[PDB]
Structure 1
Amino acid sequence: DEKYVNSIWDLLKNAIQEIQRKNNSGLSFEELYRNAYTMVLHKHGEKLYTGLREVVTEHLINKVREDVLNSLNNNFLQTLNQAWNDHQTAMVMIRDILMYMDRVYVQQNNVENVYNLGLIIFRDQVVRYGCIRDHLRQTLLDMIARERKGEVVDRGAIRNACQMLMILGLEGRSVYEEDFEAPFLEMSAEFFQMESQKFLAENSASVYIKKVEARINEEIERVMHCLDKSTEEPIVKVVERELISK
Structure 2
Amino acid sequence: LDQIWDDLRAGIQQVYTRQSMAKSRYMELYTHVYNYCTSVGLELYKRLKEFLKNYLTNLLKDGEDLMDESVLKFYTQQWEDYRFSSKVLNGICAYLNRHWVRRECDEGRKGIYEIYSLALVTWRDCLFRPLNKQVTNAVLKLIEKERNGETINTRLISGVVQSYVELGLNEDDAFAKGPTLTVYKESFESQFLADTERFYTRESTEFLQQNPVTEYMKKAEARLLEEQRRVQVYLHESTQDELARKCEQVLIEKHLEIFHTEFQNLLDADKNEDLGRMYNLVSRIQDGLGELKKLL
TM range (shorter): 0.7 to 0.9
1:15 counterpart = 2:11: yes
Amino acid in structure 1 at the alignment position of 2:29: L
Q: Give the aligned partner of residue 82 of structure 1.
A: 77
Rounded to whole Å, the distance in 2 between the matches of 1:203 and 1:70 is 42
Instruction: Identify the match of residue 31 of structure 1 among 28, 37, 43.
Output: 28
The TM-score, its normalising length taken from structure 2, stands at 0.74
Stretch moving more, 230-239 or 65-74: 65-74
On the 8 A contact 1:20/1:59 being kept in 2, the answer is no
Please tell me whether the aligned partners of residues 71 and 79 of structure 1 are also in contact (alpha carbons under 8 angstroms). Answer: no
Correspondence for 2:233: 225
Question: TM (normalized to structure 1)?
Answer: 0.88
2:161 matched residue in structure 1: 162
1:40 to 27, 37, 41: 37
Counterpart Cα distance in 1 of 2:226 and 2:103: 50
Displacement after TM superposition at 1:25 (Å): 4.2
2:58 corresponds, among 55, 58, 62, to 62
Query: Between Structure 1 and Structure 2, how many residues are aligned?
Result: 237
Instruction: Structure 1: give runs of 5+ residues left out of the alignment.
Output: none
Task: Give the aligned partner of residue 270 of structure 2.
Answer: none
Give the secondary-structure state (helix, strand or coil) at the position aligned to 2:238. coil
Shift in Å, 1:83: 0.2
Deviation at 1:74, TM superposition (A): 6.8
Instruction: Tell me: CA distance 1:228–1:7, structure 2 relative to 1, closer, same or farther (3 Å).
Output: same
State the percentage of identical aligned residues. 28
Instruction: Give me the whole-angstrom Cα distance separating, in 2, the residues matched to 1:141 and 1:74.
Output: 10
Which residue of 184, 193, 199 corresponds with 1:185? 193
Cα displacement (A) at 1:206: 4.1
Cα separation, partners in 2 of 1:205 and 1:71, compared to 1, 3 Å: closer
Question: Residue type of the partner of 2:229?
Answer: E
SS state of the match for residue 18, structure 2?
Answer: coil
By percentage of residues, which structure has more helix?
1
Q: Which amino acid aligns with 1:56?
A: L
Contact 2:30/2:92, CA 8 A, preserved across alignment: yes
CA contact (8 A) 2:67 2:135 kept: no
Larger of the two Rg values belongs to structure: 2
Letter in 1 for 2:120: L
1:182: Cα distance to partner? 1.4
- Is contact 2:68-2:135 (8 Å) kept? no
CA distance 1:74–1:200, change in 2 (3 Å): closer
How far apart, in 1, do the equivalents of 2:180 and 2:72 lie? 22
Taking the aligned partners of 2:69 and 2:247, their CA distance within structure 1 comes to 32
Partner of 2:115: 114
Shift of 1:227: 3.9
Indicate the residue corresponding to 1:53 in structure 2. 49
For residues 120-176 of structure 1, give each alpha carbon's deviation from its aligned partner in whole angstroms, at most 9, with x where no partner exists: 21112x2111x2222112101111111x11122111221222122222224511111
Per-residue deviation, residues 49-68 of structure 1 (Å, max 9, x unmatched): 111112212221111x1122
Superposed CA RMSD in Å reads: 2.0
Q: Tell me by how many angstroms 1:91 deviates.
A: 0.3
Q: Report the CA distance between 1:241 and its aligned residue.
A: 1.2
